[PDB]
Amino acid sequence: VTQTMKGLDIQKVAGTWYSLAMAASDISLLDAQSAPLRVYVEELKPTPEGDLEILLQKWENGECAQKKIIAEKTKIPAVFKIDALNENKVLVLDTDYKKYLLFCMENSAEPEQSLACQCLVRTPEVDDEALEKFDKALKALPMHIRLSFNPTQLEEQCHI
Ligand SMILES: [Pt+2]
């Protein structure tokens, strides 16, 4: 279970983002460049109807491939339905829209084996305010792996 952005203005998360940091409940979800949930968000695209398209990069067949996940709005605020990366939900935890956004993905069937969270930033500075916000949010969650990236890796295909 989770603590979410219940006042989320979906339209204001539009545009460019970089993955600064990631955390997962299970080491195996992030423990290699090919791990199923090691994904790098490039862009969030709200639809006119309040759905969300997430553009990301993922090492696949020995290439940095572009993926688009379609996230459909639900009757619960800040919770979107997906069918991707063996996940079925996206939760937005916290954002100021202009600097940082924290979100998680999970399988509702097995959240403690599926839970992956990301710190997104608007610009490739090692955002210590963003990392601090992510730290505060992860305080609550049962995370056993935490990864961070340097400014340089944010602007690279699939973070080097
Ligand atoms: Pt909030």
Domains of the chain are 1-160 (2.40.128.20)
Sign of CA dihedral 117, 122, 126, 127: negative
Tokens 């940095």 belong to which residue? 64
> Which of these, 36, 40, 45, 60, lies nearest to 10 by C-alpha position?
45
119: CA distance to ligand 1 center in Å? 14
Tokens 């990864």 belong to which residue? 147
| Structural determination approach | X-ray
- Round to whole Å and give the CA distance between 11 and 49: 10
100: CA distance to ligand 1 center in Å? 12
Protein residues placing their CB within 5 Å of the ion ligand 1: 5
Resolution (angstroms) stands at: 2.0
- Specify the amino acid at residue 67: K
Q: Is 80 helix (H, G, I), strand (E, B) or coil?
A: strand
